[PDB]
């Protein structure tokens, strides 16, 4: 699901693009303010948007949802895994775990208001 007045690609950026790494409790409010609920888990990718978008041009592989719009990053990236440890919104508190892993993104053509790449990331399908 995504906030219905946004596109999937915009929500993907909100949730997962974080080249400037942040503390989980601070960063997670940007996500949770949209839903008024504490998300249980979220991965922040510490790479620039354009480096994530470039992954969309690599070999297409099957996603968990069995679409064929997934792509494996060419390199591992730094990430932060934020996991909910206590609270109901707005008092959401998280633990953080540092990771350095490959990721698999799903991409689709942009929808109205997205930047005019051929393909934009829409889901973080998995990490490796």
Query: At its nearest, how many Å lie between Na ion and the CB of residue 11?
Result: 4
75 is in an annotated binding site: no
Strand-pairing partners, residue 96, are 82
The verdict on whether 37 is a catalytic residue reads: no
- Residues in touch with Cl ion (CB under 5 A): 7-8, 11-12, 15, 111
The verdict on whether 123 is a catalytic residue reads: yes
49 binds Na ion (CB under 5 A): no
Interface with Na ion (CB under 5 A), residue from 5, 7, 11, 44: 11
Buried b (16+ CB within 10 A) or exposed e, 1-24: ebeeebbbbbbbbbbbbbeeeeeb
Give the CA distances from residue 61 to residues 70, 78, 107, in Å, rounded to whole numbers and listed in that order.
Answer: 5, 22, 11
Q: Binding site for substrate: what residues are annotated?
A: 39-43, 64, 83
């Amino acid at each position: 699901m995504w906030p219905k007045r946004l596109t999937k690609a915009h929500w993907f950026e909100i949730q997962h693009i974080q080249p400037s790494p942040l503390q989980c409790n601070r960063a997670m409010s940007g996500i949770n303010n949209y839903t008024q609920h504490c998300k249980h888990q979220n991965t922040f990718l510490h790479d620039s948007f354009q480096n994530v978008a470039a992954v969309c041009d690599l070999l297409s592989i099957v996603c968990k949802n069995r679409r064929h719009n997934c792509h494996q990053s060419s390199k591992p990236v730094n990430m932060t895994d934020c996991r909910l440890t206590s609270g109901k919104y707005p008092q959401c508190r998280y633990s953080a775990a540092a990771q350095y892993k490959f990721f698999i993104v799903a991409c689709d053509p942009p929808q109205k208001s997205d930047p005019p790449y051929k393909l934009v990331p829409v889901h973080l399908d998995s990490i490796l």
